[PDB]
Amino acid sequence: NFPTEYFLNTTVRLLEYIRYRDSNYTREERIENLHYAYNKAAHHFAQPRQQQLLKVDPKRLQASLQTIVGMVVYSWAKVSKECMADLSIHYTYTLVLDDSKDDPYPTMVNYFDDLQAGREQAHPWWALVNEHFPNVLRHFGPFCSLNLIRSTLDFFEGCWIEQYNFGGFPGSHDYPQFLRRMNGLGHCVGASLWPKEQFNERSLFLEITSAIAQMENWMVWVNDLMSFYKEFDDERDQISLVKNYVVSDEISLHEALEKLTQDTLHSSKQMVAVFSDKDPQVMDTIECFMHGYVTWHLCDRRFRLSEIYEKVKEEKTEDAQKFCKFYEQAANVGAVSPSEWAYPPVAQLANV
Amino acid sequence: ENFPTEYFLNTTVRLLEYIRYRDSNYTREERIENLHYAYNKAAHHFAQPRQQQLLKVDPKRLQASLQTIVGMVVYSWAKVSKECMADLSIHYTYTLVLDDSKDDPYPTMVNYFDDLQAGREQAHPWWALVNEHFPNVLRHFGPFCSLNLIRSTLDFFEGCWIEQYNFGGFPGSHDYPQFLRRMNGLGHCVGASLWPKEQFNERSLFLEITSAIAQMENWMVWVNDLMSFYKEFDDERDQISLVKNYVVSDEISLHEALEKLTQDTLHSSKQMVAVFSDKDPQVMDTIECFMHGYVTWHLCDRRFRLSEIYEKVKEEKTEDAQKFCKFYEQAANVGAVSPSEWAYPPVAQLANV
Ligand SMILES: CC(C)=CCC[N@@H+](C)[C@@H]1CC=C(C)CC1
Ligand SMILES: CC(C)=CCC[N@@H+](C)[C@@H]1CC=C(C)CC1
Ligand SMILES: [Mg+2]
Ligand SMILES: [Mg+2]
Ligand SMILES: [Mg+2]
C-alpha cells in the first residue's frame, strides 16, 4: 500500500524549502515553444527509418514524445527553440528505452570494434541515437559534448542493469546510488544547459563543471521523490533508488524516503549557497531549470500526481492542503492542453 | 602540521584487519615471472616508433610509470592470465601517463564525436593510441565488462581535463570532491577488468560482477587516497586531492577531512567482506586477492614512501605500531622485489633498436 501520508509530508517539505514558483514563461511563450519542439520531433520520429528501427508501441511513442517536449521546454527555459527541439528528440530516445524490456547483450558483442571502425551499431537504439547525436551536439562546445556522450552511454548501461530486476545484495551500501548515477543522465542534462550560443565553455568552465557535479544529485533525487507515485505498483520500475535503499541498506521504506528527502533538502541548500554570488546568466538558467523541472513533475501525465490530488483534495491535514495548493500553483502555469501544441499525432505523419 | 602518524597507523592496521590481510599461495617467484612478462610486452609496445612519437612523455617518467603500473596490475589482478595482466598494464600505463600533459584538450575534442562516428583517427594523439590498442584489452572480456572499461576510460579523460584547472571546488560545493574522484578514479574500469570471460561467465555472474564494480569503485579509490596521504602531506605540488578538496569544498579541517576518508574507507571495507564472504568462491577470491595485492603494492612501491613510516615506528612497543610493522614485513617478504629482476631492458634501449 502506497504511503500516501508520508508521500505528502516529503513532497511538501521539498516544495517549501525550494520555495517552488514557476515564472519561466507567459502562457503564450510556453505554448509557442511546446509546439515548436513537438513539431520538429514529431516529423523526425515519423520518418520510415525511425519508424522501423525504434521498437515502440505508437501510443507509447506519442505519450513519451509529449512527455519529453514538456520536460525540455519546461526546464530549459533559456535556450533556443532549435535546441529545445533537438534535445526533445534525444531525451525521447532515452525515455523510450527507460521503460523498455530488452536484452542488449547480443547486439553489444561488437560494440567497440564497430564504433572504432565507423560501422553502424547492431543495436537499433544506438544506430538511431548516434546518427542523430550531432544534431544535439552542434549546440555545445567540446567539453559539454563529452559530458552528453558519456552520460548517454552511462544511461544505456543503467537500463541494462535494470533488466535483471536486481536491487542489490543486502549490505551493498554503495549499489543504490551507483545505479542511480548510471541511469540518471545527470551529466547529460547538466551539460546540455549551456549552449555555446549563450555561454562560453572556456570562460565558465568552472561554474559549468560545478553545476554538472551538484545538479546531478539534486536532479535525480527530485525525480526519485516526485516519481515515487507512478513507480510502485509498476513492474518495469520497482528497482528504484528508494526501494534499493530498502533492500541494500536493510531499512524501512519509511527510512528510505526520509533519507532521500534529507539528501535533497541538503542538495538544494548547497545549490543556493554556491550559485548566489555567481554569474547572473548562470544563476538564471539553474533557477529556471529547478522550478520548471518541478512544474513538469506536478503536471505531466507520466507521473499521475493528479491521482493523488483527487484522492486528497478533501480532508484538511496541513500537508494535504499544502500539497494541493502547490499542485494548483503549477497547474495554473503548466497545465496546458495537448490540443494546443501536440498535433498532429506522430502516427499520422508516419503514414502520410 | 606534522603527519598524524598515530591516527594513520591505527587506520591502516584496522583497514588490513577488516579485509583479512594475510599470506597467500602467490609466491615471490610467480610474481617475478608475471612482472617480467607484463613488463616485457608493455616495454616492446611503448618502444615502437609510432607509440614513441605520438606519446609525448619524458622517457624516465614513462619508464617509472610503466614499472608502477605493472606492479599494481601483477599484484592485484593475481588470478588473470599473463596476457591479460600484460594488456592491462599497457592500458593503465596509458592512463597514468595522461596526467603528464598540460595541453588543453579543447582544440582536440571539437570533432570528437564526428570523428568517432565516422571512424576517423581521433585528433588527440592520446585517444588515437588508446583506442587503437583497446581491442587487445577488450578481447579478454564480455560485452558488459567491455562497456564498463570503455566508459570509465572516457570518464578518466574528462577527469584529467578538469584537473588541468587545479580546482578543488567552490566552498559549499559538497558534491564536487567525490564527483571529481570518481571522474578520474577508473573504478568501473578496474572493477570490471577483474572478470576475464575466460574465467567467469558475465551473464551467470552478472549480479555479483555489477555489485563488485559498485563497491570496488569506492574501495579502490579511497584506499589509494588513504595510502597516498603520507606522500602528499607536505607536497606543495599536489594541490587537489579528495582530502584537500573536502577541505576546500566542505570548509572543514584537514583533520576532519581525513576522518571522513577513514570512515568511508573502513566502512567500505567491512561491507566488501560482509557481501562477498558467502557468495561464489572464485569471485570472492578475485575480490579478496585484489584488496590484498592492492595493499601490498602500496606498501612495496617506493612512490608512496611508506617505508619511511615503517622505519620510524619500527621499534615502538605500541600495539598499532607493531601490527603495522608486522603487516609491512608480510608485504615486503612476498612483494618487495628489485626492479633489476624483472623490469629490463629499459623502454628507451628497446626504442633505439
Ligand atoms: C528522461 C529520462 C530518459 C530519464 C529520467 C532520468 N532523470 C535522471 C532525469 C533525466 C532528464 C532531466 C531533465 C532530469 C533528470
Ligand atoms: C596508479 C596510481 C598512481 C594510483 C591508484 C589510484 N587509481 C585511481 C588509479 C588511477 C590511474 C590508473 C592508471 C589506475 C587506477
Ligand atoms: Mg530509468
Ligand atoms: Mg523510470
Ligand atoms: Mg523516477
Tab-separated table of C-alpha atoms and ligand atoms in Angstrom, chain A residues 180 223-224 227 230-231 303, ligand 5:
chain	number	residue	atom	x	y	z
A	180	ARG	CA	21.077	5.956	-9.839
A	223	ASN	CA	12.640	12.702	-9.614
A	224	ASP	CA	13.120	9.808	-7.185
A	227	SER	CA	8.084	9.990	-9.440
A	230	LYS	CA	3.966	6.262	-10.669
A	231	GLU	CA	6.814	3.920	-9.688
A	303	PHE	CA	3.739	10.854	-13.068
C	5	MG	MG	11.719	8.255	-11.453
